[PDB]
Write a protein that binds this DNA or RNA. Structure first.
Lengths: 80, 91, 93, 77, 93, 91, 77, 80
DNA sequence: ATATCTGACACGTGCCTGGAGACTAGGGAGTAATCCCCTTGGCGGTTAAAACGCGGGGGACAGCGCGTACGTGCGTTTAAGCGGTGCTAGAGCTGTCTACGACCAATTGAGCGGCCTCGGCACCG
DNA sequence: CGGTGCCGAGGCCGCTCAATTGGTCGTAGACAGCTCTAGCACCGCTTAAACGCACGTACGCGCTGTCCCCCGCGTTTTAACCGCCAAGGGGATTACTCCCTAGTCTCCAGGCACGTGTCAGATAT
C-alpha cells in the first residue's frame, strides 16, 4: 500500500540541496523512487542471500556491508 | 632477544602482521619475514601521511579531537589519498 | 581478542603529532581502513606469487604490489621507506 | 544527520525484502547503515545529474538527465 | 598438460546442438571465459567460507555464491539445476 | 566404480574442478565433493544457455561455424548475459 | 582490421614505457593486443560521448562532452 | 619528437565512425591524444611493474592482460 | 569572562597468549649454463593513407519571446520519533560424534599430441 | 569459362599421470541443547514535515540566421607496411646448493580490559 510513496517530496528536496543542486523540477520524485527501488532491490537481494546462507533468519550489518563490497561500493566502520 | 619490529625500530607489530598474512597463504605461502617488515613500514608511512593530513584539517579547524568530516575533507583535498580510498566514507 | 592497531596509530601519531588527541570513532574508522588496505596488499601479493607460478612471499613482492597500488610520488617514497626498513632489519642485528 | 524519515524507510525495506522471503527480521543498525549508504548513493547520482544538466546549459533537472546518467555509469536500469 | 574444457563444450553442444561446428579461436575464447567465471565462483565461495568464520566448502556455499553472481530467472534455474544434480548424485549410487 | 561426473550423469570433469578449487583453499579449504558437483552443473547449464544463444545467432546468420561477432551480438541481445560478462570482448 | 597505423603506435608505446625504464622490449603480439584493447576502449568512450551529445540536442562533439563523460564513468582524469 | 602527434586525424575520424558518432568537430584530436596518453600511462605503469617483478626485461601479453584485469577492464583469449 | 559538568579522554595495573630464538630440516628458490626465438636496427619501394587547399555549407550557438511548472508561505493534518512494555525467539554459546577429506596404491583410460581426408571458396589462369 | 586445395574437424591411435577407492584417521561442523537481548506489535502522542492551496514566476522550448568549421575531394607526399635480413640476448629451461620458513618450546611481556582523574563542549551568572 503506497509503500514506495513513503519517499516525500521535501525529503528529496532537502537531499538535492545537500546534494549540491538547487532547482529540482518536479518530474523526478517518481524517477527517484524508481532508481532507489532498483538499487535497493540489488543490494537487498545480495544481503538476504548472505544472511540465509548463514542459515539465519535476520539480517545483520555485516551482511549489508558485504553486499556493498560486492557492488564495489564498500563502506567503512563495521567489519571491512 | 628483541622484537623484530622493535629490532628494526618500527611501530607496527610484525608478528601479528605475519599471522594475518598466514591467514591467506593458499596452503603454500611462506612469509618472508622481511616481507612482513616491508608491509609494516608501508602501512606505517602511509598512515602517517593520512594522519598528518587529518591533523592539519583538525588544527586548521581549531579542534583537538578527530571527526569523520575531518578526514572527509582531508581526502577531498588530496588526489592520491582519494585514489587509495575508493570507498564511500561513513559520514 | 579481536585485534586492533589503535595503539600503534597512537604511538606513530605521537611520533609525528605528540600534542594531538583523537576521537574513538575516528580511530576505529582508521583501523577499519588500514585493515582494508592491508588485506588489499595481502591478496594482491598472493595473486602476484601465483602469477610467477611460485609459492612463497618475499619483501620484493610486497614491493611489487605496493608499487602497483600506489601512485607516483607516494609510490616512490613508499618504496624508499620499505627498502630502507628492509635494510635496517637485515644488514643489522 | 540523515535526510529520510526512518519509519518510512523501514516500511519500504520490509516490503522489498518481503517479496523475497516472509517474516524476516533486521538488525536495526543494519537498516540504519543501509539507509545511510543508499542515501549517499542517490546523492552521488544527483551530483552527476547536475553535472550533466549544467552541460545541457539548463539548470533544472528532467528525467532525461537521470536516464542518461544511469546509462553512462553503466547500471543500465 | 595445460587443461581445457573444449572437449566438454563440444560434448554438451552435441547434447543440445548435435549438428553445429565451432571455430577453434571461438572455442578458446569460450574456455577463457569459463575459466574466468569459474575462478570468480571459487574466490567468492572462499570469501563466503571465511565470512562465516569457517574453513570448509560445501555445495550449499557454491549455491550461495552463484545466487550472488547471477540475476533473476537465470539464478533460479541455476539453483534448480545445481540442487537437482546434487540430489541425483547423493541420493543415488 | 563410476566417474563421479559420469555417476551423476554430468559432463564436466568433476575431478579437474575439484583440483582447480584445491588450488585456492587458503590452507584449510576442504572440498565438499557435492560442492564440486554443484559447480560443475552450474557451469554446464549456464554455458548451455550461452551456446544456445550463440548458435541461434549463427543459424539466423546461416553459418555453421562460430565467430566472435556472433557471441558479441548474442550478449548484446540478452541483458543477464551482458551482466555476467562485464569484460570487453575480443573482436 | 584495426584502425591505427602500427608503427606510430610502436613509437608511442616505446616513449611511454621509456619514461619508466630504459631499453625495455616488447612481445610484438603484446603491443598488438594492447593497440586492440585501447582502440576498443576509445571506441566505447566515443560511443558514450555520442550518447551524451545527443542528449545535448547537438550532433557534433566538443571537449566538454569528453570531460563530462570521463567525469561520469569515474576515471576523473 | 612529436610522438603523441602520431595519432592521425583520419584515424580518429574512422574510429568515431566505427564508434557510432558521425560529426566530430575538430578540437578533440588534441583531447583524444591527452586521454589516450593518460590511459596508456596507467596501464603501462602497471604492465611494467608486473614485468620487472618477474625480474625480466621485456613485456609479455600476460602482463598487459593482468594490468587490464587490475583496472576492471579484463580482456579475453590469452591467459584469463 | 569563566568555573563547571559530564563523558570521555590519556595514565596505571594485574593477567594473559602471541612473539623471540634453536635447530632441525626439508624444500623453494637463487644461480650457472645453454639456446635459440623474437626483437630490435636498418634500407628502399610503395601505395595507400595523411596533410593541404578549397569549396561549401549547416548546425550550433549563444543573441531574442515567451507563462506555467516549481520555490515560498502559511495553513492544516498527521504520522512519526518518543516512551515504555513485552517479549521471545533467534542468535549467541558449548559437548560430541561422526560423517567427511588426505593418501597411495592400481590403473587406466580418458585425456593430450600427430594426421587426414572433407570440405570451402575462387578467380587466376 | 572455370571446379577446386590450405586450414580447420572429428576419428583415431599412441603415450601416460589424474581420478578411484579403502580404510585410516583425525577432525570441522552438525547438532542438541541451552540462556539469554534486540525486532516486532502495541499502544497514544508533539511537531515537523507533508500536502495543499495559492502565489508567483522564467527558463527550456520556439526564434536569429550564418558562416565558418567541418566534410568531401582531389592533390601531393610520405611514411607504414612489406620484405628481408641478423643477431643476439634474454626468456626459458634445466640441475644444484642453501638459506630460510616453521614447529615446538620457552617464556614473558607488551596488549587488554579494567579503573580514574581532568578537562573540552556546553550553560548561566
Amino acid at each position: 500500500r503506497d509503500n514506495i510513496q513513503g519517499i516525500t517530496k521535501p525529503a528529496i528536496r532537502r537531499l538535492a540541496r545537500r546534494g549540491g543542486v538547487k532547482r529540482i523540477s518536479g518530474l523526478i520524485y517518481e524517477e527517484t523512487r524508481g532508481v532507489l527501488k532498483v538499487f535497493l532491490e540489488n543490494v537487498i537481494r545480495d544481503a538476504v542471500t548472505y544472511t540465509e546462507h548463514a542459515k539465519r533468519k535476520t539480517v545483520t550489518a555485516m551482511d549489508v556491508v558485504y553486499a556493498l563490497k560486492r557492488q564495489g561500493r564498500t563502506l567503512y566502520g563495521f567489519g571491512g | 632477544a628483541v622484537s623484530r619490529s622493535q629490532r628494526a625500530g618500527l611501530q607496527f607489530p610484525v608478528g601479528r602482521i605475519h599471522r594475518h598474512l598466514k591467514t591467506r597463504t593458499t596452503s603454500h605461502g611462506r612469509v618472508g619475514a622481511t616481507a612482513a617488515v616491508y608491509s609494516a613500514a608501508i602501512l606505517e608511512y602511509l598512515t602517517a601521511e593520512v594522519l598528518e593530513l587529518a591533523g592539519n584539517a583538525s588544527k586548521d579547524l581549531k579542534v583537538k579531537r578527530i571527526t569523520p568530516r575531518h578526514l572527509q575533507l582531508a581526502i577531498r583535498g588530496d588526489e592520491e589519498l582519494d585514489s587509495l580510498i575508493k570507498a564511500t566514507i561513513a559520514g | 581478542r579481536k585485534e586492533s592497531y589503535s595503539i600503534y596509530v597512537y604511538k606513530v601519531l605521537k611520533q609525528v603529532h605528540p600534542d594531538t588527541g583523537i576521537s574513538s570513532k575516528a580511530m576505529g574508522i582508521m583501523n577499519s581502513f588500514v585493515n582494508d588496505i592491508f588485506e588489499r596488499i595481502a591478496g594482491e601479493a598472493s595473486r602476484l606469487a601465483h602469477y610467477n607460478k611460485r609459492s612463497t612471499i618475499t619483501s620484493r613482492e610486497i614491493q611489487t604490489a605496493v608499487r602497483l597500488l600506489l601512485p607516483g610520488e607516494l609510490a616512490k617514497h613508499a618504496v624508499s621507506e620499505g627498502t630502507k626498513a628492509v635494510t635496517k632489519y637485515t644488514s643489522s642485528k | 544527520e540523515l535526510l529520510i524519515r526512518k519509519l518510512p524507510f523501514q516500511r519500504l525495506v520490509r516490503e522489498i525484502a518481503q517479496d523475497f522471503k516472509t517474516d524476516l527480521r533486521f538488525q536495526s543498525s543494519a537498516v540504519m547503515a543501509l539507509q545511510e549508504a543508499c542515501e549517499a548513493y542517490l546523492v552521488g547520482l544527483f551530483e552527476d545529474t547536475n553535472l550533466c544538466a549544467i552541460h545541457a546549459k539548463r539548470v533544472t533537472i528532467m528525467p532525461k538527465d537521470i536516464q542518461l546518467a544511469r546509462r553512462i555509469r553503466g547500471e543500465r536500469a
